[PDB]
Design a binder for this molecule. Structure first.
Ligand SMILES: O=c1cc(O)n([C@@H]2O[C@H](COP(=O)(O)O)[C@@H](O)[C@H]2O)c(=O)[nH]1
Ligand SMILES: O=c1cc(O)n([C@@H]2O[C@H](COP(=O)(O)O)[C@@H](O)[C@H]2O)c(=O)[nH]1
Lengths: 218, 220
């Protein structure tokens, strides 16, 4: 996956007009948008097609899929019917649940990203202790795309070690949550950035600023 | 107190076709006043499906969204879900206490309810979830969670969950029917059972629901 400027916009504004306007403002800097439940549940799944129509961007559906296999299959099918290129799935519910997602992705020509570890303080309670084993499970299952946390670069580095250099790794928690763009890109292929851009006084300047700070990594 | 679930039976409406979902739900309306709507139907037909179910049927709505994000995003998901008219939302506990608290805070502000999913009914649950389950449940109790979801397919584990949360907590349980769980055995511990495919794929969903209810008649 070739992500422009190694920068994925997390578009979590819940108003359609604002989401479209802000994305338009930063479109010269990105070609990949992560769309999650805040926007989808507020404005409907048709928003995905609208983004492709306006911007021609790739769309990663950040749905943190975390159900039983039967239900995971249906969620993936509905998501890809809406035009998402990829979907993010939790590993914590186990291998069968991940495989259900991999199957639908293969059938529809899409990708699964496995979330092995999260960026927020609560991740320490249960997720961190399982993370390495979840990553190894990804490797065993043939997963090639992963998500890990900007807010713990030592843990992000370990994730990169487990999955190898061939795997693709994207990383949220940059900016608002404290992660540094450049340090994160030592290990991740691309950074995910939400509020630092879309809540900035000037989103275009914020995006340009982040890119300037990593210019030697592009 | 607790939501008064008719016949201790919650329909899991996971048909993705709007017409079929409406037809089947209408057919079992006399048996069930509480419907669980998840992402298969919502992602296929929109959040307005909650609006349509409320209009068409006299049913409470539990949004089974297994909320599993960071606190910031969890708050937004809960807000959007309650805005659409869901009475309650189901949340994962494995992302930790801050993520659960975010959901509780929104539910409190908005006059709605959170259900905490402490462990799951499928084989994959054995890998990571089961080891964390007792602590996730204890965390729920510590946070003031009153409503819980636990698996009918693991009776010993469902029993332990009931012990941890106490008799006053409200517990609902999926995995009955298609996944092999028994209605009566499950209601030893759960307040209500969740049933999907064995009702909505039946030639006669009303007869299927009636049959389940007949099998648990003395528990009502
Ligand atoms: O561990 C994770 C996994 C995520 O997907 N995310 C997501 O990445 C985005 C981060 O946005 P922000 O840059 O505003 O903090 C949000 O959409 C959030 O749901 C995260 O923050 N941490
Ligand atoms: O551990 C769990 C938690 C669930 O919410 N569920 C949900 O309960 C329902 C089970 O439906 P069914 O009776 O067709 O197996 C599905 O909506 C599923 O997503 C489950 O099966 N196991």
């Amino acid at each position: 996956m070739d992500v422009m400027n190694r920068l994925i916009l997390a578009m979590d504004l819940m108003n359609r007009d604002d989401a479209l306007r802000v994305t338009g403002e930063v479109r010269e800097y990105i070609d990949t948008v992560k769309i999650g439940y805040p926007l989808v549940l507020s404005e409907g799944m048709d928003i995905i097609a609208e983004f492709r129509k306006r911007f021609g961007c790739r769309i990663i559906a950040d749905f943190k899929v975390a159900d039983i296999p039967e239900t995971n299959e249906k969620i993936c099918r509905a998501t890809f019917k809406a035009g998402a290129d990829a979907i993010i799935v939790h590993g914590f519910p186990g291998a069968d649940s991940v495989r259900a997602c991999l199957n639908v992705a293969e059938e529809m020509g899409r990708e699964v990203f496995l979330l092995t570890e999260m960026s927020h303080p609560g991740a320490e309670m249960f997720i961190q202790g399982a993370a390495d084993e979840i990553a190894r499970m990804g490797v065993d299952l043939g997963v090639k795309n992963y998500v890990g946390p900007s807010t713990a670069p030592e843990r992000l580095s370990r994730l990169r070690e487990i999955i190898g250099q061939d795997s693709f790794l994207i990383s949220p928690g940059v900016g608002a949550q404290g992660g540094d763009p450049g340090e994160t890109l030592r290990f991740a292929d691309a950074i995910i950035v939400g509020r630092s851009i879309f809540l900035a006084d000037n989103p275009a300047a914020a995006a340009a600023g982040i890119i300037e700070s990593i210019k030697d990594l592009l």
